[PDB]
mmCIF file of C-alpha atoms and ligand atoms in Angstrom:
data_model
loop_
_atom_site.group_PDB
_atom_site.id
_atom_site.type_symbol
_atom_site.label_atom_id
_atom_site.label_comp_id
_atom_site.label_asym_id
_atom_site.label_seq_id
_atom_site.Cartn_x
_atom_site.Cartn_y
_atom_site.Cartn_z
ATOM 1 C CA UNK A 7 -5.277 -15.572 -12.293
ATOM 2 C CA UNK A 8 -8.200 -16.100 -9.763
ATOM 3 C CA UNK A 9 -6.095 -14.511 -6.861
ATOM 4 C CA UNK A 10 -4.739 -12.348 -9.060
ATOM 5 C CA UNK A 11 -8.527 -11.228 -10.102
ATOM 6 C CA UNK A 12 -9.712 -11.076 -6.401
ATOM 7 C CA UNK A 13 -7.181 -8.776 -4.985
ATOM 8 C CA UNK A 14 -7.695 -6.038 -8.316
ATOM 9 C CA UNK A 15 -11.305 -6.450 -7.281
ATOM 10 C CA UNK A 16 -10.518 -5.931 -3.326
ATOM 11 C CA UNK A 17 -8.323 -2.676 -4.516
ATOM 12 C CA UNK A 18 -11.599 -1.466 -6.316
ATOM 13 C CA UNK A 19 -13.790 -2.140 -3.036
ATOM 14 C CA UNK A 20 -11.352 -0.173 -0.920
ATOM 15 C CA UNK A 21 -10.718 2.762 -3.141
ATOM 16 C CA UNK A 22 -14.580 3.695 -4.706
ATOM 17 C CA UNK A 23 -17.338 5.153 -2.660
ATOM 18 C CA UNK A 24 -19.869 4.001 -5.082
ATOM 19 C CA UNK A 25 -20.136 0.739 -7.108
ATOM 20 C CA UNK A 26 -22.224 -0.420 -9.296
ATOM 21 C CA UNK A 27 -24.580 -2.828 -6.417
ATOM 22 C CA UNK A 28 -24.409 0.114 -4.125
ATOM 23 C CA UNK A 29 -25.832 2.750 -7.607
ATOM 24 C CA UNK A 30 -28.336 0.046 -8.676
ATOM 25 C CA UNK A 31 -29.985 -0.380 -5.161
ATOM 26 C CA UNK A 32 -30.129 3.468 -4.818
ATOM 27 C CA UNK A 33 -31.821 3.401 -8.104
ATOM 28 C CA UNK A 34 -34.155 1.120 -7.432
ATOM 29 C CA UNK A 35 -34.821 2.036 -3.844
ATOM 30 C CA UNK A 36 -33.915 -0.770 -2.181
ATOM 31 C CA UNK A 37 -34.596 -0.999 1.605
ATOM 32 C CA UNK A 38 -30.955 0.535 3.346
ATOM 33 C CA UNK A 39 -30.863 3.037 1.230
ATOM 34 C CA UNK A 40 -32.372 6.451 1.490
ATOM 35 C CA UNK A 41 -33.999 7.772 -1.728
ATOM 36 C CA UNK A 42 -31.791 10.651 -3.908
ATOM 37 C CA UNK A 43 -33.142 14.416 -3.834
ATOM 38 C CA UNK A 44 -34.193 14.917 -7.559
ATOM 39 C CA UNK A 45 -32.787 17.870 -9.319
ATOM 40 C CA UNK A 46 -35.077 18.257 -12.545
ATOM 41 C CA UNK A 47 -34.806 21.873 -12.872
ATOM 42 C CA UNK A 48 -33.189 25.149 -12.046
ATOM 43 C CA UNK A 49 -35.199 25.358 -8.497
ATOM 44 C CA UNK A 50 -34.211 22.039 -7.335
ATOM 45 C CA UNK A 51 -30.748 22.569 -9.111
ATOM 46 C CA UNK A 52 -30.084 25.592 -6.631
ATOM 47 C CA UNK A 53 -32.219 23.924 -3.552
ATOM 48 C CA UNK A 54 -29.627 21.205 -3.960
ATOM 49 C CA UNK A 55 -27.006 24.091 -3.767
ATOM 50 C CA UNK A 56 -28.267 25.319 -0.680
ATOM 51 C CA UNK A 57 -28.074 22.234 1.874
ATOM 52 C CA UNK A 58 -30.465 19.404 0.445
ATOM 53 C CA UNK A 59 -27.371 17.840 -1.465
ATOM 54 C CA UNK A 60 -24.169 19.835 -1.458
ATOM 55 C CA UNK A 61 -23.026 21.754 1.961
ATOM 56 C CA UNK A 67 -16.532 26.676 -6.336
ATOM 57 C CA UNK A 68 -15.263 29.635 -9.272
ATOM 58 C CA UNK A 69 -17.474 32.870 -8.976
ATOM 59 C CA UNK A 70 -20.698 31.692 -10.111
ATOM 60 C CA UNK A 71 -21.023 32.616 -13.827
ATOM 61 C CA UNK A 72 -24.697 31.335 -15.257
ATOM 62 C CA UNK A 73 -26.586 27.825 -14.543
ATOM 63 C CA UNK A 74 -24.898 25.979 -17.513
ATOM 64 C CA UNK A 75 -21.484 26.654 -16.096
ATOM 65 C CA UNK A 76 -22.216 26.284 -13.025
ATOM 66 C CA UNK A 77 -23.354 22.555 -13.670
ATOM 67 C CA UNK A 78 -20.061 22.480 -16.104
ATOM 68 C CA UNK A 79 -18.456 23.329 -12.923
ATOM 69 C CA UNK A 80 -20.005 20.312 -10.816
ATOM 70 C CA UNK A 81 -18.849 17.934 -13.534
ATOM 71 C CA UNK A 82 -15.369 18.955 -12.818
ATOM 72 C CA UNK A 83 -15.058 18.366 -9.081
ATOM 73 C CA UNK A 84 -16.672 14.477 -9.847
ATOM 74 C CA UNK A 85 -14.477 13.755 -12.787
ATOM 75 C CA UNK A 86 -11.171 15.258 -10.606
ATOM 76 C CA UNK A 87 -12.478 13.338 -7.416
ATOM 77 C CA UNK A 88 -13.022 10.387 -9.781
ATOM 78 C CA UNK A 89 -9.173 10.311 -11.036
ATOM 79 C CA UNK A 90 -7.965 10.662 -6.945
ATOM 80 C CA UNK A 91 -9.692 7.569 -6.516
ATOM 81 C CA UNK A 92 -8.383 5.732 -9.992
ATOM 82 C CA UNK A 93 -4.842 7.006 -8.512
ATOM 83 C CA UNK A 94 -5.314 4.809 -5.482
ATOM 84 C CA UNK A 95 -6.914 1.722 -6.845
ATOM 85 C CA UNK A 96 -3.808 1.972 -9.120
ATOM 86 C CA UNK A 97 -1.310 2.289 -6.910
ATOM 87 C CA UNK A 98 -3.261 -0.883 -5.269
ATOM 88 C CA UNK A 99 -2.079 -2.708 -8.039
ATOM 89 C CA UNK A 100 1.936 -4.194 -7.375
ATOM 90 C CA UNK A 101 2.626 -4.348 -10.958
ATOM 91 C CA UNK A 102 1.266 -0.514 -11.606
ATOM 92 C CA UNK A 103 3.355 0.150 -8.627
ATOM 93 C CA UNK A 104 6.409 -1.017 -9.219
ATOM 94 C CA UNK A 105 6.231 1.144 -12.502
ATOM 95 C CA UNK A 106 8.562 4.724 -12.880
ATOM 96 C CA UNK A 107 6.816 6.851 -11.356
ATOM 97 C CA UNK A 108 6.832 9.558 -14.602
ATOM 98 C CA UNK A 109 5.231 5.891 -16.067
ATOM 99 C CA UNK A 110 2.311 5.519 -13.685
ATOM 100 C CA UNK A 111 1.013 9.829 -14.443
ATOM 101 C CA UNK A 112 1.354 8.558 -18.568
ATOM 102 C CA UNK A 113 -1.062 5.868 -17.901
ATOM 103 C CA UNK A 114 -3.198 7.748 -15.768
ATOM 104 C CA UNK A 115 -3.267 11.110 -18.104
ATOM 105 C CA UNK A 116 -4.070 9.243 -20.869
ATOM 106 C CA UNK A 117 -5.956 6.440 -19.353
ATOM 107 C CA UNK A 118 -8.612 7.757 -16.609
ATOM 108 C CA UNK A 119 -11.241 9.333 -18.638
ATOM 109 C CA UNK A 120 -11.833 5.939 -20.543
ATOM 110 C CA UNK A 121 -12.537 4.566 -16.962
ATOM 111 C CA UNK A 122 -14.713 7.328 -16.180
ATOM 112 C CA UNK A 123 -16.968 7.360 -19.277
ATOM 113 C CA UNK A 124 -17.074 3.304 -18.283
ATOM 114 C CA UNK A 125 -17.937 3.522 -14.759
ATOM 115 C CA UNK A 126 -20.193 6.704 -15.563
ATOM 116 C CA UNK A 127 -22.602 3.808 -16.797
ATOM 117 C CA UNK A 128 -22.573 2.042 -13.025
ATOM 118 C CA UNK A 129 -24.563 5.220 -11.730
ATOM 119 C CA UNK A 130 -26.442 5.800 -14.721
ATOM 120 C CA UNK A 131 -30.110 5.235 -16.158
ATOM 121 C CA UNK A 132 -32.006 6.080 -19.301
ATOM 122 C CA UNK A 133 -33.757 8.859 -16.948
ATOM 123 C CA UNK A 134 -30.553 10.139 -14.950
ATOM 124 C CA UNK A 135 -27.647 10.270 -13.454
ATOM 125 C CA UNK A 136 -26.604 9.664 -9.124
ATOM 126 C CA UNK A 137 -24.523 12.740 -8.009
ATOM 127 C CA UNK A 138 -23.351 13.687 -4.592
ATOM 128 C CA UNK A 139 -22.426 10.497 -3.338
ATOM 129 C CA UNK A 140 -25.874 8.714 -4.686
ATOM 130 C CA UNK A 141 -27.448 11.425 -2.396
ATOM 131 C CA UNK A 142 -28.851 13.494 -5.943
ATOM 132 C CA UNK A 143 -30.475 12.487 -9.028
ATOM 133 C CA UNK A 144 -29.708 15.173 -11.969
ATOM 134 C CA UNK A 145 -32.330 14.269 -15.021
ATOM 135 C CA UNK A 146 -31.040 13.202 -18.701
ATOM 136 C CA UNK A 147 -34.002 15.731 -19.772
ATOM 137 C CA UNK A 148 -32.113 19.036 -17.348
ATOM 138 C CA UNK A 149 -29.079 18.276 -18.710
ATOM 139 C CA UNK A 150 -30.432 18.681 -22.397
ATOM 140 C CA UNK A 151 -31.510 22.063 -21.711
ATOM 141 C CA UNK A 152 -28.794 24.035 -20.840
ATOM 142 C CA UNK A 153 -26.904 25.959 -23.060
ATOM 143 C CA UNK A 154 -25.104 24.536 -26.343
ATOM 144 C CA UNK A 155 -21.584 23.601 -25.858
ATOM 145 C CA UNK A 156 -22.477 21.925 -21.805
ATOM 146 C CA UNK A 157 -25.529 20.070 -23.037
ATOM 147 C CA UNK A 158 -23.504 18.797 -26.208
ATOM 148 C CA UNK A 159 -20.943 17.385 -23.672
ATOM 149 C CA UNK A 160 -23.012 14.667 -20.958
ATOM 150 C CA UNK A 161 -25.321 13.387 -23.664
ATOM 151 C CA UNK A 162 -22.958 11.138 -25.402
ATOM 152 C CA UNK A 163 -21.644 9.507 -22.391
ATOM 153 C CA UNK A 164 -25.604 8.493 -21.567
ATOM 154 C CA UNK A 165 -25.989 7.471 -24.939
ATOM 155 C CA UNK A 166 -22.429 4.771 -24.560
ATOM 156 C CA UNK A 167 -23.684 4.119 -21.182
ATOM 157 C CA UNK A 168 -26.777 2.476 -21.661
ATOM 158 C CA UNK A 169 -25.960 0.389 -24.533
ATOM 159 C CA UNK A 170 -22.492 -0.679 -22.318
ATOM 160 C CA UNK A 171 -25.356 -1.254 -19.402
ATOM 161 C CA UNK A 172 -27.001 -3.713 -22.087
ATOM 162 C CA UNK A 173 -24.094 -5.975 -21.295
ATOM 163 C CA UNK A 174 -24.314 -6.294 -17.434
ATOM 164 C CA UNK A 175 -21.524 -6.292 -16.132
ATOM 165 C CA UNK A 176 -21.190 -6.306 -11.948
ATOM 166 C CA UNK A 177 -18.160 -5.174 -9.767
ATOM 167 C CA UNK A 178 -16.020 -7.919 -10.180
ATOM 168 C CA UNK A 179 -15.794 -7.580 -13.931
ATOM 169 C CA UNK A 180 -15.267 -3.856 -13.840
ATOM 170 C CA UNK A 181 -12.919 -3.965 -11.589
ATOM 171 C CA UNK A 182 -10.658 -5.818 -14.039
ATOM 172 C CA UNK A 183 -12.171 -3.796 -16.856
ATOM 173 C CA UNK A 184 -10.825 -0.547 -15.048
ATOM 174 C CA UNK A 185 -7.450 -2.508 -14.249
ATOM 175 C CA UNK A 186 -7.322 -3.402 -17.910
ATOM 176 C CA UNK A 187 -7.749 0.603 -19.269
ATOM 177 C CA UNK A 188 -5.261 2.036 -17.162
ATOM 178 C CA UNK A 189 -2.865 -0.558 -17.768
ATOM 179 C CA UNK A 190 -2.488 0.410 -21.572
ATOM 180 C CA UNK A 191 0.821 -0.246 -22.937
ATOM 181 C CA UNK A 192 0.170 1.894 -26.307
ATOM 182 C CA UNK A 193 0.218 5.129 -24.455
ATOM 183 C CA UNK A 194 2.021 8.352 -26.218
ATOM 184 C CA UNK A 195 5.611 8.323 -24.096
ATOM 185 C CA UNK A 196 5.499 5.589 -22.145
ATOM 186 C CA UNK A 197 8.503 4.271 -21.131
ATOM 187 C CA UNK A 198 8.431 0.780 -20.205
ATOM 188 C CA UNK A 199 6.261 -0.370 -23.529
ATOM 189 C CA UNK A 200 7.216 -4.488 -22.971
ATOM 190 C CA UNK A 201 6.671 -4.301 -19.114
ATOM 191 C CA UNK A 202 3.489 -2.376 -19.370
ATOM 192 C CA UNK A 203 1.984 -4.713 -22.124
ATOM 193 C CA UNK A 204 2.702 -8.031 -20.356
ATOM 194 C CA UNK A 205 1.051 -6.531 -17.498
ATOM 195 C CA UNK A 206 -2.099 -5.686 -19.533
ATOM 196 C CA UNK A 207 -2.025 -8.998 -21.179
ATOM 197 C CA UNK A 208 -2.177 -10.950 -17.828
ATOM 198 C CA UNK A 209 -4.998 -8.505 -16.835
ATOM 199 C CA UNK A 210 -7.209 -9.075 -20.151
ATOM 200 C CA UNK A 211 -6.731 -13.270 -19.622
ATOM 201 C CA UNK A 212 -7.408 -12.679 -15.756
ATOM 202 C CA UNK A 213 -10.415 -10.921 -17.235
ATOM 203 C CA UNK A 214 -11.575 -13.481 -19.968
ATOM 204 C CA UNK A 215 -10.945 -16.504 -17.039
ATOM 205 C CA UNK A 216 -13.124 -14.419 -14.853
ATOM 206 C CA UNK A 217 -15.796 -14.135 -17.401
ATOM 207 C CA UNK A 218 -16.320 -17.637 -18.320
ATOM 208 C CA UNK A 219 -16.913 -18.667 -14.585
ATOM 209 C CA UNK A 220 -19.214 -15.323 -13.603
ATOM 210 C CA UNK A 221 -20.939 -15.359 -17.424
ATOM 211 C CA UNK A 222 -20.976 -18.844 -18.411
ATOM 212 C CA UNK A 223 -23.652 -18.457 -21.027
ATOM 213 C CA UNK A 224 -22.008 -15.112 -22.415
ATOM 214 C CA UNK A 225 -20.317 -16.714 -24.958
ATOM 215 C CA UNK A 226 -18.689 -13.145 -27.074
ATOM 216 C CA UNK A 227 -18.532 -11.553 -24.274
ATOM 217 C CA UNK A 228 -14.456 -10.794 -24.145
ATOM 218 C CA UNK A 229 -14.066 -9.597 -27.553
ATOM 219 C CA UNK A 230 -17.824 -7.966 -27.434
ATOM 220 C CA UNK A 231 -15.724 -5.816 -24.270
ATOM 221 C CA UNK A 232 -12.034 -5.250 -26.119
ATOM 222 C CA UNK A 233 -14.768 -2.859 -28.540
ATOM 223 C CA UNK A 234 -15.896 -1.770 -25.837
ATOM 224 C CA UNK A 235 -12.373 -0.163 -25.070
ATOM 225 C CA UNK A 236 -11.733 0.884 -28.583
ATOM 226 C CA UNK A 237 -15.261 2.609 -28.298
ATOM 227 C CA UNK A 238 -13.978 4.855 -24.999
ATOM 228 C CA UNK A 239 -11.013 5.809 -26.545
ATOM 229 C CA UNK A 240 -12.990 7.519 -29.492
ATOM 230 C CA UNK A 241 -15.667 8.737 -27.191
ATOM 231 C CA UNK A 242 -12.552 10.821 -25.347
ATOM 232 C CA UNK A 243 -11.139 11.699 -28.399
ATOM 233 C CA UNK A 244 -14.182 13.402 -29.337
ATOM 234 C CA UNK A 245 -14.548 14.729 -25.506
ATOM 235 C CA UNK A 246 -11.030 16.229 -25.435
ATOM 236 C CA UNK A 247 -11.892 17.933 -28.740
ATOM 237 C CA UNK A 248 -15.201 19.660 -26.723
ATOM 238 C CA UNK A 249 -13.090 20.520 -23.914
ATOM 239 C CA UNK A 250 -10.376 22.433 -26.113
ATOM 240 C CA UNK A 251 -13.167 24.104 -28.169
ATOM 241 C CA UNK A 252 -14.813 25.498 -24.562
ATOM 242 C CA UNK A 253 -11.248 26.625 -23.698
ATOM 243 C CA UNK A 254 -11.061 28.438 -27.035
ATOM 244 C CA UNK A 255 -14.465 30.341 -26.698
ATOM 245 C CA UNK A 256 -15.955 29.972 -22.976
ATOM 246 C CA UNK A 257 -13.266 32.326 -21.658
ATOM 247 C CA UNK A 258 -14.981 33.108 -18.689
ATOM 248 C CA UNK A 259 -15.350 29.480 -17.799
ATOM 249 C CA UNK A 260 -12.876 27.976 -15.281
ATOM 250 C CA UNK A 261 -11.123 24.792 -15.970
ATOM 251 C CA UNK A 262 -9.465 22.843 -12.974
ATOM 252 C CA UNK A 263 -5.438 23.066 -13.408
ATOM 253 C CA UNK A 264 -5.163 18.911 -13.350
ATOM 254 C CA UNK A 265 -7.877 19.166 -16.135
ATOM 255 C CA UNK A 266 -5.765 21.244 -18.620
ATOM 256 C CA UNK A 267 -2.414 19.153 -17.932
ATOM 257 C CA UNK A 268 -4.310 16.157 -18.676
ATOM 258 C CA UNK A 269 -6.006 17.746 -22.458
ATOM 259 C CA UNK A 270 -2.737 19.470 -23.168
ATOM 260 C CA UNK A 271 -1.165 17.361 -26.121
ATOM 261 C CA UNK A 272 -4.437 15.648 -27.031
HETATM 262 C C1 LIG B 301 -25.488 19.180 -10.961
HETATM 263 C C2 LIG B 301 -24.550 18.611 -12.021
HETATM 264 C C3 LIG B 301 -23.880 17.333 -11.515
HETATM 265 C C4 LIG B 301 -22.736 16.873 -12.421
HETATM 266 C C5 LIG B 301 -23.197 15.785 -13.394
HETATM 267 C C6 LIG B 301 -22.000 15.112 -14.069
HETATM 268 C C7 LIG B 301 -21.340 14.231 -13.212
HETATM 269 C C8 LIG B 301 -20.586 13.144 -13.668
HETATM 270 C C9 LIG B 301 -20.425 12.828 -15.019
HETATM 271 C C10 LIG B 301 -18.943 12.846 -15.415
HETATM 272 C C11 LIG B 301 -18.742 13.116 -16.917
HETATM 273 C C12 LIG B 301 -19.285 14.489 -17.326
HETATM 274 C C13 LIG B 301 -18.729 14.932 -18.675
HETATM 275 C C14 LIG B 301 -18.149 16.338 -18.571
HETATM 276 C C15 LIG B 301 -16.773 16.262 -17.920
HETATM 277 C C16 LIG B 301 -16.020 17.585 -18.015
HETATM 278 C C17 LIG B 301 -14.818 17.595 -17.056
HETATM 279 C C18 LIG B 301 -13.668 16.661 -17.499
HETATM 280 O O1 LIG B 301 -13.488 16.508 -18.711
HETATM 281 O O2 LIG B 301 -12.980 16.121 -16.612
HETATM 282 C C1 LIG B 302 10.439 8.020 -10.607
HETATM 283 C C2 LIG B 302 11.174 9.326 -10.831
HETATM 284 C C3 LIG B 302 10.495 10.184 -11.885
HETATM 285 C C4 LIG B 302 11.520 10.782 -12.832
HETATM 286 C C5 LIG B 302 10.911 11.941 -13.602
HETATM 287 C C6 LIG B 302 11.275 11.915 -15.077
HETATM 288 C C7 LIG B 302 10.487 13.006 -15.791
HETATM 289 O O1 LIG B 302 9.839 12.461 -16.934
HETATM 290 C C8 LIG B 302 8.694 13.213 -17.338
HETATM 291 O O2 LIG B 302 7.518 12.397 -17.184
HETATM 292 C C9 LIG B 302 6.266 12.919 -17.664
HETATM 293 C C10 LIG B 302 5.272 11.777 -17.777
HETATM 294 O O3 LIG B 302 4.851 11.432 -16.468
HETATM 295 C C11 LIG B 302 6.340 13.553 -19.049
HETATM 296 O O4 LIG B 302 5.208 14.419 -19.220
HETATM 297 C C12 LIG B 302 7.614 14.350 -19.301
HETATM 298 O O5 LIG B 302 7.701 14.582 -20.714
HETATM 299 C C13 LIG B 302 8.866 13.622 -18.803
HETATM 300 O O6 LIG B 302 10.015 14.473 -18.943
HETATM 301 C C1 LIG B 303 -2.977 11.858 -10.556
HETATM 302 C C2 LIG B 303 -3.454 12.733 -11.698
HETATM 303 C C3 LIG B 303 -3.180 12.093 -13.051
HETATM 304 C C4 LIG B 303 -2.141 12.917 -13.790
HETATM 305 C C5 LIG B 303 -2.704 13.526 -15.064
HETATM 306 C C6 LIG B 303 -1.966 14.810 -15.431
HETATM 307 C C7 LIG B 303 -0.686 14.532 -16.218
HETATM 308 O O1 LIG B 303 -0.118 15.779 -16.603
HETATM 309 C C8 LIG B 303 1.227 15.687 -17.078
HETATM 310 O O2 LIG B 303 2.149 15.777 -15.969
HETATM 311 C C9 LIG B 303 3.556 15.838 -16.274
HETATM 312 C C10 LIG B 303 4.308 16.234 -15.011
HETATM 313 O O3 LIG B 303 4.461 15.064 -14.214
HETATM 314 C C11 LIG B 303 3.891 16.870 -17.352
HETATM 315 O O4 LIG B 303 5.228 16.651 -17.835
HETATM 316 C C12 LIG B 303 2.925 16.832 -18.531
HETATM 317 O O5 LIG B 303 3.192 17.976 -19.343
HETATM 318 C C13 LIG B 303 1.466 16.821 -18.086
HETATM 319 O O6 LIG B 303 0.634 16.635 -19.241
HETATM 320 CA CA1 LIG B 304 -1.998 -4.195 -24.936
#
């Protein structure tokens, strides 16, 4: 269970740019770090366009095109979940038709949770912790974008309450993907006894890096029930967008992963 921790926790060091210690240093401008480039309005939003962050679809209008930016992170974001997967023997070993039903249904639950890593009350890191995009921008653009990032902030700082570090979300991660209740998975028993030995690696883990957390396991299995309503509700947004934002590109792996939800 403690090697069996470590390694999960290895495969999340070796497979995501940005943790949680590297976001929190950047946030609080710790010495090796150089400072973000703030975008907290349309001219820094398209200074940050032109070279002072980021070196796309036909440009449409500002709302979309910051719609747009959301989609590269969150389709960069499941490239890396992919890997640390694979990185885990059990997931591995899996069909492989298995392994896409976990990850279709299971990524945007780890995104919404890791969203919270790079997150503030203020703000968000983007670019590699090389931008800062304000809570306050985001809440001005048009209706059905600004509707979209504000609940994530709102789970993220109460799930940033808890304070959590990398080792714990690293099994936390492990722990969503692995999901044995998945619509048309194949190997239910396999997949569940997999899960279950992550969620007791998880509670051992907690006890020895928390020791005065006592609620802290079952305050986190909410936690889980919580993202899987908050993408509920997200998939829901996205299909409504596709319905009436019909000049608004959506990434092909994006509609593939909403189609049946
Ligand atoms: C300049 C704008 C930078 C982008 C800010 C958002 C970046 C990361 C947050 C990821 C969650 C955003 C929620 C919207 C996701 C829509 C795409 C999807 O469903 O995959
Ligand atoms: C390891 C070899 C892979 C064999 C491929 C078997 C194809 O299964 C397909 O897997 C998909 C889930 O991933 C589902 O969306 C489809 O409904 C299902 O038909
Ligand atoms: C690595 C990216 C994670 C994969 C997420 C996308 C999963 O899409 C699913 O892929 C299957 C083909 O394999 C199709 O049968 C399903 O209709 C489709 O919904
Ligand atoms: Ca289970």
């Amino acid at each position: 269970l403690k090697a069996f921790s470590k390694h999960i926790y290895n495969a999340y060091l070796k497979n995501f740019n940005m943790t949680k210690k590297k976001a929190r240093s950047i946030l609080t401008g710790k010495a090796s770090h150089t400072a973000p480039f703030v975008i907290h309005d349309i001219e820094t939003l398209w200074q940050a366009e032109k070279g002072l962050v980021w070196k796309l679809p036909p440009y449409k209008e500002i709302s979309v095109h910051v719609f747009y930016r959301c989609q590269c992170t969150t389709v960069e974001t499941v490239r890396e979940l992919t890997e640390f997967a694979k990185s885990i023997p059990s997931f591995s070993s899996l069909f492989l038709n298995d392994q896409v039903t976990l990850l279709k249904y299971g990524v945007h639950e780890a995104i919404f949770a890791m969203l919270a890593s790079i997150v503030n009350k203020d703000g968000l890191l983007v670019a590699n912790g090389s931008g800062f995009v304000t809570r306050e921008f985001l809440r001005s653009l048009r209706k059905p974008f600004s509707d979209i990032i504000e609940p994530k902030f709102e789970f993220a700082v109460k799930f940033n309450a808890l304070e959590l570090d990398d080792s714990d979300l690293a099994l936390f991660i492990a722990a969503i993907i692995l999901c044995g209740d998945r619509p048309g998975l194949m190997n239910v028993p396999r997949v569940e006894a997999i899960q279950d030995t992550i969620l007791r690696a998880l509670e051992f883990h907690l006890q020895a890096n928390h020791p005065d957390a006592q609620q802290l396991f079952p305050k986190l299995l909410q936690k889980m029930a919580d993202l899987r309503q908050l993408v509920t509700e997200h998939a829901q947004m996205m299909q409504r967008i596709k319905k009436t934002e019909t000049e608004t590109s959506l990434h092909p792996l994006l509609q593939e992963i909403y189609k049946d939800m």
